[PDB]
């Protein structure tokens, strides 16, 4: 732990003809395990991790049924939202939804979440206690009233606290060889001279999993954030992640600077010097 299961759904309307383009992806932690793409020929939920291929045809039948139903919910939503916001049929609009559950190291439920956006802006989301809704504007307040009367939060809370967690546990066990393995960052430092008086030190972390990591610089043992650049953590494409952090230093003073790396896969925090 900790661990999580999350599903992400995107529907984009197609003015002029036919249904929205719908893409659904499921993750356990930072590992995608299933996907559905309305533009794909199979029209089935497809495996994306070898451990989910253990599941039988009944699982796949069921997930395909549910995800296609999800797609129709978004299709109807796009039309409704166009009405709420008094928009024309001319433009493409998007709905996004994400939900999922987090468990701690003991694999017990920690938190659940369910959030919805229209055209990239908050629309409605379950509150932290999974018992009520946060509606961003009057259109979403109309939806909140509807979902209150239909007891949607109660259904979702039951799922998030029960089924979501139970299935996360199942996946963690079935996929133990990779899901429960941590890959510590492989680190090194590079050096470049911009001019006679200024150098850049870059501290690299490669090949790590999960994606959560902290990379920081110190100067003479004290936190250094000025004259640093930290790139967004990025996927390697083989399941692992990469990140780097750089600092600009006076040439000849490189020895004052140290990079510090924290990650789940490192029992002791790590230090690099030039």
């Amino acid at each position: 732990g900790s661990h999580s299961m999350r599903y992400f759904f995107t529907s984009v309307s197609r003015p002029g003809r036919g249904e929205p383009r719908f893409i659904a992806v499921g993750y356990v932690d930072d590992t995608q395990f299933v996907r559905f793409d309305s533009d794909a020929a199979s029209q089935r939920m497809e495996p994306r991790a070898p451990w989910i291929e253990q599941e039988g045809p009944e699982y796949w039948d069921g997930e395909t049924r549910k995800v296609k139903a999800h797609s129709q919910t978004h299709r109807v939503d796009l039309g409704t939202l166009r009405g709420y916001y008094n928009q024309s049929e001319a433009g493409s609009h998007t709905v996004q939804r994400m939900y999922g559950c987090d468990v701690g190291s003991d694999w017990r439920f920690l938190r659940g979440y369910h959030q919805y956006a229209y055209d990239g802006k908050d629309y409605i989301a379950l509150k932290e206690d999974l018992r009520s809704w946060t509606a961003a504007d009057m259109a979403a307040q109309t939806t909140k009233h509807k979902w209150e009367a239909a007891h949607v939060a109660e259904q979702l809370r039951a799922y998030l606290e029960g089924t979501c967690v139970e299935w996360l546990r199942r996946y963690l066990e079935n996929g133990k060889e990779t899901l429960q393995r941590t890959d510590a960052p492989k680190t090194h430092m590079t050096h470049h001279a911009v001019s006679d008086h200024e150098a850049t030190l870059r501290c690299w972390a490669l090949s790590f999993y999960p994606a959560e990591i902290t990379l920081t610089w110190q100067r003479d043992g004290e936190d250094q954030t000025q004259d640093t650049e930290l790139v967004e953590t990025r996927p390697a494409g083989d399941g692992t992640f990469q990140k780097w952090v750089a600092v600009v230093v006076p040439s000849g003073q490189e020895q004052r600077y140290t990079c510090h790396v924290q990650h789940e896969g490192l029992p002791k925090p790590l230090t690099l010097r030039w």
């Binding site: 999800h70 409704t80 939202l81 939804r97 939900y99 509807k146 979902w147 949607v152 089924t163």
Partner: peptide, 9 residues
């Protein structure tokens, strides 16, 4: 394992 949605906005 997906939740049944079905509640439209």
């Amino acid at each position: 394992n997906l939740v049944p949605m079905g509640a439209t906005v």
